[PDB]
Design a protein around this ligand. Structure first.
Ligand SMILES: OC[C@H]1O[C@@H](O)[C@H](O)[C@@H](O)[C@H]1O
Ligand SMILES: OC[C@H]1O[C@@H](O)[C@H](O)[C@@H](O)[C@H]1O
Lengths: 134, 134
């Protein structure tokens, strides 16, 4: 009952991952994890409506062998409870580029130095409606 | 080398699962599996161009607690190596309905009596590019 989990993605540098989902009507936060596996994440994309002291804050972090890295926070929050939201994530050797619903873009360093993303997992108040790879 | 693997799909009866992927240019066949897990498949969708002694025939079968059931072969074959193909799948407790690229649709008995589909997997000859739930 958690969220969609996909493996063997083999997303190489330069490829874009497009994820469209539904934010729960009473969402507190949702997560989109990308990486090698559940313990090695190049991107922990975590928009928080109201959770852990954050109010409408997008928090991103890396996870190397189970250990969380230094969190990064964005200046915009183009997400609304009970509404469709789409995010596009591009993979590069140095950084991951994330484009939000409203077109805002930001980068998150590829700390684990992954050469390919093979794992994706969604969880929280986000019901995935479609995923596309390129 | 296998294809994409998705779990926690939570596909419910009546929902439409649209899968679009690229058929390898030198594929002798390809597989799209759906079910509870790798050992319990409500649908083993296997178009065969030239494999296992068959030619341009779509072979369907189920796998219950590891055991393969009786195969069913389809009447059409709207597939070709080295091209993009999309299939649309839905189900109820009695049957699964598979719609092909040519708009043709057939039914395959839901032998596992599944009330939800949580697992999907493609092999090395079918590269999934898009997955939708509607
Ligand atoms: O640094 C990332 C982590 O931050 C925590 O506050 C949160 O509870 C975890 O689920 C994870 O998001
Ligand atoms: O009916 C399903 C089965 O068909 C056989 O021909 C094949 O060798 C098995 O691996 C399995 O796919």
């Amino acid at each position: 009952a958690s969220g969609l989990v996909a493996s063997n993605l083999n997303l190489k540098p330069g490829e874009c991952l497009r994820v469209r989902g539904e934010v729960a009507p009473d969402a507190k936060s949702f997560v989109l994890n990308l990486g090698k596996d559940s313990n090695n994440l190049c991107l922990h994309f975590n928009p928080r409506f109201n959770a852990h002291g954050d109010a409408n804050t997008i928090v991103c972090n890396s996870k190397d062998d189970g250990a969380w890295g230094t969190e990064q926070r964005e200046a915009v929050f183009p997400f609304q409870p009970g509404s469709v939201a789409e995010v596009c994530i591009t993979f590069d050797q140095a950084n991951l580029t994330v484009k939000l619903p409203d077109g805002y873009e930001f980068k998150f360093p590829n700390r684990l130095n992954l050469e390919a993303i093979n794992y994706m997992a969604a969880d929280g108040d986000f019901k995935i409606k479609c995923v596309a790879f390129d």
